[PDB]
Each structure stands twice: as C-alpha cells, then as structure tokens.
Amino acid sequence: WTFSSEEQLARLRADANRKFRCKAVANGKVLPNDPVFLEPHEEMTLCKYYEKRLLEFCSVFKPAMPRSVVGTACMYFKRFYLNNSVMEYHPRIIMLTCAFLACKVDEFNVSSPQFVGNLRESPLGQEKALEQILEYELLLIQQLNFHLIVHNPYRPFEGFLIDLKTRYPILENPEILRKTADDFLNRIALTDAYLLYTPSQIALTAILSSASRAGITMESYLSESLMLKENRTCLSQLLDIMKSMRNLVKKYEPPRSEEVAVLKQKLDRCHSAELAL
Amino acid sequence: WTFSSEEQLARLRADANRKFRCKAVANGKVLPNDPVFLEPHEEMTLCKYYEKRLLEFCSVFKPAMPRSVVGTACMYFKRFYLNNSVMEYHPRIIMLTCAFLACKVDEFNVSSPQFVGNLRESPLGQEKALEQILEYELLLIQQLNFHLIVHNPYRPFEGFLIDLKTRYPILENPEILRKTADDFLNRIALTDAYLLYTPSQIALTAILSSASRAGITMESYLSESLMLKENRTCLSQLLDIMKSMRNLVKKYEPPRSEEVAVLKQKLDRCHSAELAL
Numbered sequence: 001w002t003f004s005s006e007e008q009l010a011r012l013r014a015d016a017n018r019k020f021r022c023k024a025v026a027n028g029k030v031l032p033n034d035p036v037f038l039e040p041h042e043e044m045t046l047c048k049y050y051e052k053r054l055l056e057f058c059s060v061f062k063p064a065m066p067r068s069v070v071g072t073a074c075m076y077f078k079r080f081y082l083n084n085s086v087m088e089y090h091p092r093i094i095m096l097t098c099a100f101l102a103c104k105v106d107e108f109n110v111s112s113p114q115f116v117g118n119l120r121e122s123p124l125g126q127e128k129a130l131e132q133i134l135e136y137e138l139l140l141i142q143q144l145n146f147h148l149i150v151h152n153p154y155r156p157f158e159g160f161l162i163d164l165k166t167r168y169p170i171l172e173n174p175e176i177l178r179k180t181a182d183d184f185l186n187r188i189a190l191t192d193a194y195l196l197y198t199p200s201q202i203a204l205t206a207i208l209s210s211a212s213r214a215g216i217t218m219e220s221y222l223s224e225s226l227m228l229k230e231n232r233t234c235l236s237q238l239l240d241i242m243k244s245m246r247n248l249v250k251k252y253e254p255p256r257s258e259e260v261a262v263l264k265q266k267l268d269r270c271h272s273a274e275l276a277l
Numbered sequence: 278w279t280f281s282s283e284e285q286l287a288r289l290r291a292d293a294n295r296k297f298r299c300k301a302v303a304n305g306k307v308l309p310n311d312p313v314f315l316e317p318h319e320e321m322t323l324c325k326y327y328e329k330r331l332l333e334f335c336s337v338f339k340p341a342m343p344r345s346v347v348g349t350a351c352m353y354f355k356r357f358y359l360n361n362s363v364m365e366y367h368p369r370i371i372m373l374t375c376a377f378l379a380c381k382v383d384e385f386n387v388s389s390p391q392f393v394g395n396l397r398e399s400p401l402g403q404e405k406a407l408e409q410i411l412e413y414e415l416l417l418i419q420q421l422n423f424h425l426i427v428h429n430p431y432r433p434f435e436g437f438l439i440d441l442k443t444r445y446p447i448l449e450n451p452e453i454l455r456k457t458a459d460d461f462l463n464r465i466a467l468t469d470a471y472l473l474y475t476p477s478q479i480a481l482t483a484i485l486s487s488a489s490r491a492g493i494t495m496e497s498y499l500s501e502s503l504m505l506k507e508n509r510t511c512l513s514q515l516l517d518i519m520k521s522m523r524n525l526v527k528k529y530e531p532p533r534s535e536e537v538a539v540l541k542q543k544l545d546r547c548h549s550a551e552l553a554l
Contacts, residue, residue: 104415112411127404134389134411138381141415146423 001079001147002195006248009192012082014040020085024275036270042263043086049255050091051077051190057099061118063110065103071152073102075194080143082195087270089136096129097136105148153185157203163225164207168218171211181210184249191248197241198231205242278356278424279472283525286469289359291317297362301552313547319540320363326532327368328354328467334376338395340387342380348429350379352471357420359472364547366413373406374413382425430462434480440502441484445495448488458487461526468525474518475508482519 003009017040025032051074058070076098103110112133116126141148165174185206193202211218222235233241280286294317302309328351335347353375380387393403418425442451462483470479488495499512510518
C-alpha cells in the first residue's frame with residue numbers, strides 16, 4: 001500500500017474502469033462503447049470532488065473529529081478506488097463509509113446515529129445513509145485487503161515542529177509555521193502523495209516548504225539534525241522527494257464546477273439504469 | 278481456526294472471562310470477587326441459548342436463508358466468544374451481527390432493512406438493531422482475525438449422499454436419510470465439533486450415524502469407497518473421530534429454562550452498571 005509511480009496507480013485505476021465496462025457489457029444492457037460509461041480521467045475528477053466533499057464533512061463534524069481520523073478516512077477512499085469503479089459503488093456512499101470505518105478503526109468515540117446526525121437531511125434520510133454504510137462496510141474492509149492501519153503525517157509533523165522550536169529558538173512562534181504547514185499538508189493530501197511517500201517525508205515537506213514560503217531558511221537543518229535517517233534517503237534523495245511532492249501539488253487540477261455537474265449526471269444516469277444487475 | 282482439544286477452547290474462553298474481570302476491576306466500579314461477574318461456565322450457557330435463538334431467527338428468516346449462511350453465522354458466533362466476554366459485548370447483538378455479516382460474506386442477496394425486517398419489533402426498534410450491527414461489524418470482523426471464509430458440512434454432505442445413492446441403489450430413498458442426517462447435523466452444530474473437526478468428517482458422521490440410527494449398515498462403505506482420503510485419517514482414526522463427535526453430542530447439556538432466566542438477568546445487570554466505562 002505504498003506504490004512506486006503515478007503510473008502504477010494510473011494502471012490500477014484503468015484496470016478498475018475496464019473491469020466494470022466488461023462486467024456491464026457482459027450483463028447485456030449496454031454496448032462496449034456506450035458513452036454512458038465514465039472514462040478513467042472522468043472517474044478521477046469525481047473522486048477529487050468527493051474527497052473534497054469528504055473533507056468538508058469532517059470539518060463540520062460536530063463531535064470535533066481528530067485529524068488522524070480525517071486523514072485515515074481519505075486514505076481509504078483513495079485506496080478503494082485504485083481498484084474499483086465510481087460507476088459500480090457510488091463515492092457519495094463510499095466516502096461516508098470511509099469516514100465511519102475510520103472513526104471505528106481509530107477508536108474515535110462516535111456512535112452511528114451521532115455520525116449520520118451530521119448530515120443535512122431529515123431523520124429518515126440520515127437513517128437511510130446509516131443503512132448504506134452497513135451495506136458497504138465489509139466491501140470497504142475487503143477492498144482494503146483487510147489492512148486498516150494507516151500512518152498519517154500529523155504525528156511526525158508534531159515531532160518536526162518540536163525539533164525546530166527547540167533547535168532554533170528564534171522561531172518560537174511556530175503557531176504561524178504550523179498553520180501554513182497545515183494548509184500545505186491539506187494540499188498534498190489531495191494528490192496521490194499519500195499513496196506515494198512516507199508520512200515523515202510528507203510532514204517534512206510541509207514544514208520545510210512552508211517555513212521557506214515564509215522566507216526563513218535553516219540551511220543547517222537536514223544535515224545537522226537529520227544525520228539520522230528512518231525512511232530511506234541519503235540526503236540527496238530526500239531533497240528530490242520534496243521536489244517531487246512539491247511538484248505534485250503544483251500540478252494538481254481541482255475539479256471544475258460544471259464538468260462535475262455533467263459527470264455527476266452521467267454517474268447518476270449510470271447508477272440509474274441497471275448496468276450492475 | 279480448527280483446534281486440538283475441548284481443553285484448548287476451555288482455556289481460550291477462560292482467558293476471555295478473566296481479561297474482562299480485570300478490565301472491569303481496573304476501571305474501578307467493582308471488586309474482583311463481585312458476584313455480578315459471570316463465571317466461564319455461565320457465559321457458556323448463555324452462548325448455548327443464543328446460538329439456539331440464532332438458529333430460530335435464521336429458520337423464520339422470510340427471505341429463505343440458505344444453510345451455508347446459517348452455518349457460517351454460527352461459526353462466527355462461536356469463534357467470537359472463544360476470546361471475548363458475553364459481559365462485554367452482548368450476544369443478542371453479536372448474534373444478529375454474525376447473521377448479517379454471514380449474509381454479506383456468503384453473498385446471500387439481502388439488504389439490511391430486509392434483514393432487520395425479520396425481527397418482531399416496531400419499525401424504530403428494528404432500525405435500532407440495524408444500528409447496533411453497524412457498531413459491532415468491524416469488531417466482529419477484527420475478532421475473527423479477518424478470516425471470514427468458513428467451510429460448512431452441507432457441501433461434502435450432499436456429496437456423500439450422492440456417493441451412497443449411486444453406490445447402494447437400494448437406498449434410493451435418501452429423502453429419509455437426509456432428513457435424519459440433517460437433524461443429527463443440527464445437534465453437532467450445537468457442540469464445539471465445528472471448531473474441532475473438518476466439515477467432511479462432520480458430514481460423514483451425520484450420514485453414517487443416521488443410516489445406522491435407522492438400522493441399515495453398509496459394512497463395505499468406508500473401506501471400498503473411502504480408500505480415498507482428503508482429511509487426515511488411516512481409517513481407524515476416522516472411526517475414532519466419529520466416536521468422538523458422536524460422544525460430544527451425547528454429552529451436550531442444553532441451556533435450562535430458569536438458569537437462563539437468572540443468567541440473563543445477571544448479564545443485563547452487568548451491561549446495566551458501567552463496568553466498561
């Protein structure tokens with residue numbers, strides 16, 4: 001569950017898209033080239049959109065949801081779709097299933113009625129969503145190969161922040177660093193970076209690249225402090241990895257208002273006709 | 278998930294009982310020798326009772342539930358409690374969670390509202406049960422070590438029945454054999470036999486021991502047909518294994534009406550006071 005390239009994820013996602021196309025066509029009600037089907041690239045936009053809808057949900061989640069939970073939930077959502085089609089299991093539901101499962105896994109103390117209680121729908125509407133999470137729970141757990149422990153960036157982040165503040169007492173005002181570094185971490189979390197690097201490299205990139213966004217530079221930081229090494233890197237590599245992630249977020253295209261509007265409708269029209277009977 | 282003795286399961290169950298006692302006592306509200314706690318032997322009675330309540334539920338389950346499902350569900354229930362206390366997770370709920378998970382795992386086509394629809398409770402009461410299954414789903418899956426595939430006796434049973442009817446055309450009236458052998462299989466399913474032997478040995482014992490209950494004896498059956506061997510046994514062992522299971526069901530003490538009434542009340546009084554805060 002930590003891959004070697006954007007190409008490797010591209011392939012997996014493509015496979016998932018074909019597998020459904022073939023299943024749908026196999027179950028007769030549609031021709032192989034029917035434009036009802038979403039293209040891998042279209043699935044992606046919808047996933048970007050839902051991952052954002054996922055983030056919003058967690059942000060407003062009244063019983064204040066810890067960042068370990070929101071991070072875990074997003075990792076699930078991503079991994080699910082590396083080999084599953086948006087056309088087969090609706091991401092509106094899978095998204096909410098990832099949040100719930102994540103609360104359970106991370107032992108975040110919240111009951112299901114409390115959880116669905118955070119949805120802007122009538123009491124029965126919310127009960128209905130609770131029902132759908134029961135439907136997809138095992139599916140989600142199975143599609144994750146039963147590997148539910150996900151290591152988030154927030155832990156090594158707090159550690160790097162600690163390292164800096166005691167090592168460079170000048171910046172004893174990290175309250176500014178943290179907020180910036182958090183903003184940047186959120187952007188990385190929206191790319192495939194979580195599936196591509198260690199959470200430490202991810203935490204490190206958020207901090208060094210945010211302090212730097214601020215102007216300040218600790219030219220002796222990596223060398224002096226990080227003579228130590230936990231996640232594979234003779235300094236140089238790390239510098240390239242940071243350049244790599246820093247690039248990923250630079251080239252991240254957010255879902256656009258209207259395309260989503262179209263693709264949602266396609267996705268809805270897809271779940272509408274029995275393609276999966 | 279196939280053990281070497283009733284002693285091995287006895288130990289596991291005992292451990293589970295102590296672990297809770299210690300957790301409860303650790304969380305202060307109770308003394309180590311408080312009679313509120315159930316003894317391992319008492320847990321057992323309650324489990325026998327619930328496994329029967331489990332069987333009844335599946336029997337009346339309107340969208341006719343296949344025997345693979347009911348068998349799988351009972352295996353879960355048993356395995357859950359090999360290392361978990363009835364005092365900690367109520368078997369009324371775990372029982373229903375095992376049924377649901379089993380429908381999902383075996384791909385028995387039934388939705389959650391359909392499932393809970395089979396409970397003799399008001400619409401909200403049933404929704405409440407659906408909620409509790411969502412609560413315990415992951416727990417159940419985790420406590421099963423993520424091993425959800427359970428091989429039932431019904432498959433090799435149908436095969437042995439086929440073997441007999443073509444090999445001894447006299448008994449071409451197996452409709453009688455089957456019903457008897459099924460009745461006996463139900464009795465084995467209530468003992469630890471499922472956790473102790475292969476489903477083939479279990480299927481074989483149900484058939485050979487039921488034909489025999491009927492009077493008829495095929496002295497050339499094992500030797501002539503079963504020169505073949507899939508599950509460890511130089512004839513002799515098998516004969517001893519059949520003697521073993523045949524013994525287990527002989528010495529199975531069903532839960533008694535009033536003791537249950539008491540133990541339920543103890544169990545309820547247990548879940549009543551916060552022992553698990």
